[PDB]
Amino acid sequence: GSSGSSGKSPSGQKRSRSRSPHEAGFCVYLKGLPFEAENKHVIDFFKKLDIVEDSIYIAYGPNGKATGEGFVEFRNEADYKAALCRHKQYMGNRFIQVHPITKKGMLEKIDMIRKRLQSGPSSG
Template identity: 45%
Template sequence: MLGSGGVSDGYEVGSKRQRMMESTPYFAVSSSAGGYQPFNYGGSPQPPPFPVVRLRGLPFNCTDIDIFKFFAGLDIVDVLLVNKNGRFSGEAFVVFAGAMQVEFALQRDRQNMGRRYVEVFRCKRQDYYNAVAAEVNYDGIYDNDYHGSPPPSRSKRYDNDKDQLEYTEILKMRGLPFSVKKPDIIEFFGEFKLVEDRIHIACRPDGKATGEAFVEFESAEEAKRAMCKDKMTIGKRYIELFPSTPDEARRAESRSRQ
């Protein structure tokens, strides 16, 4: 499924989470315990161990692409970067295609990502389910493919975190269709003053779009005003907006050139 430095064709970060949960016994959902519970098939054989690992000690500028590179050659199904109070915590969960992939992943424990060594260790599937629940604060599954339904309601705390962040002239877009082009983004922000030649659509090293983009506006104030477009649609996709920085945008652009 994976090449030496990429991700399987059609892969989208987090966007297949709902279909994955619906189609495998690992992911049957129950809200009775306040999180995601594996379905009990009543006497049928238990499924094999859930193929997830937890990462700790990640650089705070880490992205999904950095994790793909760290596990180059392995079949990744999902990556969940853990945020606390609107900031990346340095931890992540990575779900693989099977138990053998987990064994290979564990061999990369304490290898370096940049200047930091990363811990890779086993964890329980419930830890992953709880992290998903905390990420969305919603009794369901967050998926970029809403297909016409509104996105899950986020808590007021989640929205307040965005309001309290320091704004620059850069906004990050997440959840974009893979086919999105610059004219689509210009149209999306039609009533706001952006710098058209400073729109960067992020790509993986293999040239495929990640579903993210960085957009520069004429001022930080204009970028903050444009945040009113958060959770609006391009096509059938609900788009999330986040305050970003020129450094983050430059790093994304640099990775696309690699």
């Protein structure tokens, strides 16, 4: 194991908390994804694991470009814990951060994000 050297490029400088303890499966919040990110990229990151190809959700900008945010849900638990052990990693040539998120909270965002891509006079 060569210690070598690497670079540090933090982003967001923000944290998340929980108001009340509620039930929730195993999900992961990825930040830093590339502009051309794709379900494949999300998998290549947490390879050798059981990820619901369906669950794998990625936020896309209004210009047809990945904003740099994704979400994954590991069916099993033992496989979920490992996902967290894969922090401070670089997606090939990009840098992404791994942070645990509650299913419920995970959808919360996915909802607000869609409201940005959805085009309609209806509030929701």
